[PDB]
């Protein structure tokens, strides 16, 4: 690739954590040099705290600035809660229905239920055989974040299809008021 | 834990590269194009329901740059340790011959935030309609990145995402084909 001169990385992170809407909020400010977090401000603690010796000079210094300290303590409101409200309609409430397709991966076949383009992540996918839910023989990839505010998942069912059997993939997601289902006939 | 919003910025030397962005539960809300001193929404509709004054980011970066120098001396010039990326290629949906789909190249857990990604179709690099994200934050403090390639599924095409990063000795290529 070229240019192997050594590198120096500095990262700053202000994390706003929410529990039950804005009922409980926790601000977390982190400073990272290369890959090591050095100093942080945790709203639940109130002041700065060194994480490693490199951050101490800073935790002490910043902690000696009572003004700054108070601003950070109230940022839990002026910053977090504020920002939460700013984009709630298009983040917390963003809703996109998943597209559901079912296809066979040979006697002991594998039925694949693909669920894609959905949001938010919370979802449920179940497999049924003649209306009766199958739990064993089911494996899953879990949530796959596509990086475009969309998720996808593959829930696969291992089974020896018998002629006349009816397999169903059922999906429950915040975007639909009633469960989606796609069927495969053996 | 129901939601998390992260304001994440960084400065890297000797590259003189800086980044400023906000992400929601792992997705990018927007970032600030440093050269255009402009706010860029991950999804355009976002820019109709909210705004961010891009200048504030430029001021934050300047302080980040200065602090990077401070930390660089304080540590006795300890350079970062390269961590090569994990690469995986997938389609954003199930592929169906001659029906619009999208090849996704996910470059995960690496640092520093500098990388080279190239889409190869039958050995040759493509660029028509390709997009990519900026460097997304990870709690372990490494990065993730997405690159996209809209394509028409065909049984006679072979694609490759080609990745280069200081942590690797040679180009890492992830193949994908129908």
């Amino acid at each position: 690739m070229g240019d192997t001169r050594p590198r120096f990385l500095w990262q700053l992170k202000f994390e706003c954590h929410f529990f039950n809407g804005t009922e409980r909020v926790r601000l977390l400010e982190r400073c990272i040099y290369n890959q090591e977090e050095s100093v942080r401000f945790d709203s639940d603690v109130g002041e700065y705290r060194a994480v490693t010796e490199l951050g101490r000079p800073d935790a002490e210094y910043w902690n000696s600035q009572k003004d700054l300290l108070e601003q950070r303590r109230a940022a839990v409101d002026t910053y977090c809660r504020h920002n939460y409200g700013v984009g709630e309609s298009f983040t917390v409430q963003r809703r996109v229905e998943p597209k559901v397709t079912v296809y066979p991966s040979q006697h002991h076949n594998l039925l694949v239920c693909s669920v894609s383009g959905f949001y938010p992540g919370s979802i449920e996918v179940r497999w049924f055989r003649n209306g009766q839910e199958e739990k064993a023989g089911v494996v899953s990839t879990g949530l796959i974040q596509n990086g475009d505010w969309t998720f996808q998942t593959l829930v696969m069912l291992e089974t020896v299809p018998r002629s006349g059997e009816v397999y169903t993939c059922q999906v429950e997601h915040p975007s639909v008021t009633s469960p989606l289902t796609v069927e495969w006939r053996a | 834990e129901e939601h998390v919003i992260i304001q994440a910025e960084f400065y890297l030397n000797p590259d003189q590269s800086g980044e400023f962005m906000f992400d929601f539960d792992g997705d990018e809300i927007f970032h600030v194009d440093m050269a255009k001193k402009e706010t860029v929404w991950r999804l355009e509709e976002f820019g109709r329901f909210a705004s961010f004054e891009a200048q504030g980011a430029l001021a934050n970066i300047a302080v980040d740059k200065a602090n990077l120098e401070i930390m660089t001396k304080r540590s006795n010039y300890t350079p970062i340790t390269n961590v090569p990326p994990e690469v995986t290629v997938l389609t954003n949906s199930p592929v169906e011959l001659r029906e619009p789909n999208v090849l996704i190249c996910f470059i995960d857990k690496f640092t520093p935030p500098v990388v080279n990604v190239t889409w190869l179709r039958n050995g040759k690099p493509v660029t028509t309609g390709v997009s990519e994200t900026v460097f997304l934050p990870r709690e372990d403090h490494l990065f993730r990145k997405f690159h996209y390639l809209p394509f028409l599924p065909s049984t006679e095409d072979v694609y490759d995402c080609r990745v280069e990063h200081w942590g690797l000795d040679e180009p890492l290529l992830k193949q994908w084909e129908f």
Binding site: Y61 | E9, F30, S51, N60, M71
Partner: peptide, 13 residues
Amino acid sequence: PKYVKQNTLKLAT
């Protein structure tokens, strides 16, 4: 609506 960022602080020198 307007997003409000936290300000970067100068480290000890």
